[PDB]
């Protein structure tokens, strides 16, 4: 038989065998119920849909988002989601392989205990795991040391890994991923005030997230360019509907992992975090994470994120000793591609949970057994 | 949200943990590894008593 | 006239006049200043506060720490509660005493000159003094020989005293204070996932650690206990808002201390650490020492600690000699109480500082002048 | 659209101005939606009679009081945003934790819709039931909550520092429309 890998890191959802260069398809975990009396009797009423079905669907349906802050919100959602994904894209059964959990490090037990509490019994699974998203993203990039930033859909990273070791101590984590900026986007956009608010509504800026966006090189500088010019600003298109333009509103939104005043927290940005990080993490170590220093997925798509860091990390950084980051072009996809390399090693045989474990002790089992 | 939500959330994550964290299994390892005064001395009684 | 003494050891911060039995008032040396807009126009714009006013005004103020690891990092913002300090509490000019200055050991010769420059130039003082912690420990505690253990809010410390006399090659100084294992709360706290990151959150904590903590009699069997009995559980309120309700998230935290792994660092901890200053110093003295065996403020205040320290002697002692340990009720105020009595003997009066030496001869006075 | 179930009906914009008046008048809040249901079933108290500006008398059912749920059910024309309450409750939760029961304390409503009697105590029976109950809660309704803006502008306008505060006619002059947005909030 053969092994199968489920992505759960939020956003759209990965799933595929190891050995495949990437997942057969990908889903938002979007959730959504229909809002209004259903009054074509001819019409079947389901009442719950997900993934591009309801992406077509949306509008009558609203949304549940099942995931906050990288943490599932419900679960029997969550179980409504997955077994779709198996039937209808994977044609699978829960027998037919090992699978592999992909998850948020540092945080609560519960994520994990009732998940495999689920699958084990729910769905009935040869063996699991789940594993830290970091891992995989140095086992894709093949360097063995380092520190990534993915900041995806969900919470927000860092975490340096040396060579073959975890420094959970050295590993810092933020709710400051693209949704929650999203959503601070509307409080920009009313300024030009073509302004709606609802999920579905929230989504649509995805879009333009992908397509208007692009990455401050210098803040007061672009300001003066601001003032001098609107090539800086672009024209868009409603998904259907009006045009729509957009000046400085775009590279705006970026800063804010720069400076979350704009959404107010303290923690001192991406970039400050990082070398604070550094700063607990032992001396010797630093020059090699000043070579390798990697990055991934949702936010990280921007054009340009990778230099003003540079530029940043020249700043706190001693000039003297060399200093680059990698940024792959994959790297949205890095991390379920990791889990299949992940998959591929014969290790986990040794490794995985059995059934017979969680019939022999409880979820306890994975907080030893698991990182 | 404050059904949605907290029905699960308050509910649930109540009940949070139990384990003996192979986490600590590691501080148990290291700190077996870093008893200096453990090890050393226990060799050097052991040794030095034996004098021919 | 009359002589007064400031305590700058780390945390709430206690001033006194020779004699009184306790400090007037005390106060914890956050510093914070605003983080948003000022909308009321009718109000006063303050830009820096500190002390319980802050502790009260804090939540749109962010705080600043002015003391790191015992090192005090900004000086003019020690300035300003320096300067608040007199004259809001103490109604006192600094012409008007001696004072007397409350140091953490073996620490850069920094914090000696510039305080001493400040506080001769910019307040203008009869006479200075700057005092190791230990000495006041011993005073206050009346045995001329000892070793004291006091980790405050600031960096801990192992010195054996002998009577009289110094052995400052003895002499262990550690950065593992409650603070920083506060911020591994954190860490451990988001297993729960009731989850907050900033530093007045990090201070709410610190009621926590009033309340809520007890110190492990044994690791293992405290393990089993856990893993039988939720009377190790206890359920505890938000400050206002929620209950929140807490298990072996107490008890773990003080065995940092024991093995700092959580947060990791190799020092082999305060036992072990104290165990082997011990066998640096030499054979004859021991003795006393298994016999005269002190300990004091922040984290000792923790029920139990005593117990287990004394079984982890007995582990590395002979058992063959007599072991005890003092841990008197008032350990928190011990040092400013014996700063009192350092204050009261007359032979500071041969000893202080005065102005015309710092006329005469740079901050390089102190250096030979105090120990 | 409410209306057209008695089918005493009219639109135009002076036509639905002329419910103003009733809004004035005829409106109360819902203190509980099923209980109120029940009672519509027993009684007609809950029915008043009402004279058209010039007219006609006119007769109101829970038509009266099924308008302002509006407000706690932003279904009726349908929108999701969970209402005034649950908004309230999820902007506080974004707010930081040790601010709250200020909050809980201080609570604040002011003019057009607030005027029904009776707003207040199912808001504080919302709260009751979102709020943990063990903190205390209130919240505070002025007589003169309509007027309320233009009191305080009067405030506003009285302290000295706005002289240090105001626009001139000279920025104006030496910049543009943009300087407000730097200037003022
Ligand atoms: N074309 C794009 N440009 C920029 N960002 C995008 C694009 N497509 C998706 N994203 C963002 O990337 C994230 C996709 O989820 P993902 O990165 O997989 O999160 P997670 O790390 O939780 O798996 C979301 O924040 C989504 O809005
Ligand atoms: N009720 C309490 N229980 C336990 N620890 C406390 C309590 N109150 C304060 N502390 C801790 O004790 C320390 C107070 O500072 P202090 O001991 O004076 O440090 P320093 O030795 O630098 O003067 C801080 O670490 C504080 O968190």
Same mark, same amino acid.
């Not at chain 1, 927000?156 to 890994?161: A, D, E, K, R, S």
């Not at chain 1, 530029?311 to 000793?321: D, R």
């Not at chain 1, 290790?347 to 059995?354: C, H, K, L, P, Y």
């Given at each position: 038989t053969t092994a199968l890998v489920c992505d759960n890191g939020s956003g759209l959802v990965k799933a595929g065998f190891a050995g495949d260069d990437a997942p057969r398809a990908v889903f938002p975990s979007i959730v959504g119920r229909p809002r209004h009396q259903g009054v074509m009797v001819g019409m079947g009423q389901k009442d719950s849909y997900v993934g591009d079905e309801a992406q077509s669907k949306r509008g009558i349906l609203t949304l549940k988002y099942p995931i906050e802050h990288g943490i599932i919100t419900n679960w029997d959602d969550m179980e409504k989601i997955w077994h779709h994904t198996f039937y209808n894209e994977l044609r699978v059964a829960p027998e037919e392989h090992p699978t592999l959990l992909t998850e948020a490090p540092l945080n609560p037990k519960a994520n994990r205990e009732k998940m495999t509490?689920?699958?084990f019994e729910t769905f009935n699974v040869p063996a699991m795991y789940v594993a830290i998203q970091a891992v995989l993203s140095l086992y894709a990039s093949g360097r063995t040391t380092g520190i990534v930033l993915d900041s995806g859909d969900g919470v927000?990273?860092?975490?340096?890994?040396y060579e073959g070791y975890a420094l959970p101590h050295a590993i810092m984590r933020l709710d400051l991923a693209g949704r929650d900026l999203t959503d601070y986007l509307m409080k920009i956009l009313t300024e030009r005030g073509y302004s709606f608010?609802?999920?579905?509504? @929230?989504?649509?800026? @995805?879009?333009?997230?992908?397509?208007?966006?692009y990455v401050a090189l210098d803040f007061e500088n672009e300001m003066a360019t601001a003032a001098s010019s609107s090539s800086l600003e672009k024209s868009y298109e409603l998904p259907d509907g009006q045009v729509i333009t957009i000046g400085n509103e775009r590279f705006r939104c970026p800063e804010t992992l720069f400076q979350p005043s704009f959404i107010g927290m303290e923690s001192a940005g991406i970039h400050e975090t990082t070398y604070n990080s550094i700063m607990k993490c032992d001396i010797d170590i630093r020059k090699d994470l000043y070579a390798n220093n990697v990055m991934s997925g949702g936010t990280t798509m921007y054009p340009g994120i990778a230099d003003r860091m540079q530029?940043?990390?020249?700043?706190?950084?001693?000039?003297?000793?060399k200093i680059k980051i990698i940024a792959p072009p994959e790297r949205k996809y890095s991390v379920w591609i990791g889990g299949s390399i992940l998959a591929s090693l014969?290790?986990?045989?040794?490794?995985?949970?059995?059934?017979q474990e969680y019939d022999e002790a409880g979820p306890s089992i994975v907080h030893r057994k698991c990182f | 949200x404050x059904x949605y939500x907290x029905x699960x959330x308050x509910x649930x994550x109540x009940x949070x943990x139990x384990x003996x964290x192979x986490x600590x299994x590691x501080x148990x390892x290291x700190x077996x590894x870093x008893x200096x005064x453990x090890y050393x001395x226990x060799x050097x009684x052991x040794x030095x008593x034996x004098x021919x």
């Open positions: 509490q689920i699958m927000t990273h860092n975490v340096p890994i608010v609802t999920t579905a509504e @929230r989504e649509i800026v @995805r879009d333009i997230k992908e397509k208007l966006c530029k940043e990390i020249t700043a706190l950084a001693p000039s003297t000793m014969s290790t986990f045989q040794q490794m995985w949970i059995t059934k | -």
